[PDB]
Structures are given as C-alpha cells and as structure tokens.
Design a protein around this nucleic acid. Structure first.
Length: 49
DNA sequence: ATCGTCGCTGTTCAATACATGCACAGGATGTATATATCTGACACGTGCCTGGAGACTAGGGAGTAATCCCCTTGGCGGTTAAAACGCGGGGGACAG
C-alpha cells in the first residue's frame, strides 16, 4: 500500500531545477507521512508521498 | 524579451577486473619398515703338540751408601733498549 497527494498550484514557488525534495518525520511511527514531494510536469504541481 | 526545455560535454565518483604477494593442500619419490627366506660364518667340541711352567745355578746388573764439586739459584744495582700508552688517519674488513 502507498498513496499520493496531488497539489495543483497557480504559480511556481519551489526550486524549478530540483525535481524532488524530502521531509523527514518527527517520529518513527510517522516516518512515511509526507516524506517526499515531486516536480516533473508542465503545470506547477507537487506530488506528496 | 523571458523562461523553460532540449539537444550538444567534461569531471568526478564508484564499481569492477586484473595483477602481485602469501599459505595450504596434493602427489610422488625416497626412506623407513614389515616380512619371509635362505646362507655361510661363528662358536663349540675334539684331538693333538709346542711353548709355558718348574726347579736350580751362576753371575753380573742394580741397589746403596759415601764423597765431590759443578751447576744452579739468588740477590743487587746501572745504563738502556724495549715495552707501553696515546693520536691520527688510512686502507683493509665486511656486508649488499
């Protein structure tokens, strides 16, 4: 089981040259909670994991 | 213009393959050993005789004491060459 969270924005507000950046969790039980987003489509969209 | 993306490259980092130093099984060649076997050289027994043993003598070689003096030890001192100590360095030893 895994899931994805789509975030459609109206303007670029990250680093365009970076396709993905990680976010560590505070605890071990929630390590797989929103740990990585993605950028690789035309529209400014982030894909949470 | 203005931003993003797509063709063209280098530079570094990591992964892999090769080369070099080291130990440990593996065989084969010789040595040691196990065994069977047959031999002739050693040990003994016998028989025979020459060299060792016994008994005696005579005689001189050696042991023994008594005397001699030569040779060896010993102490002393005086110049004196030889031994001893030290220095410096060179060539001979010894290892790679």
């Amino acid at each position: 089981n895994l899931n994805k969270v789509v975030l459609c924005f109206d303007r670029v507000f990250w680093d365009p040259s970076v396709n993905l950046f990680g976010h560590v969790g505070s605890t071990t039980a929630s390590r797989g909670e929103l740990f990585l987003f993605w950028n690789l489509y035309k529209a400014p969209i982030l894909l949470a994991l």
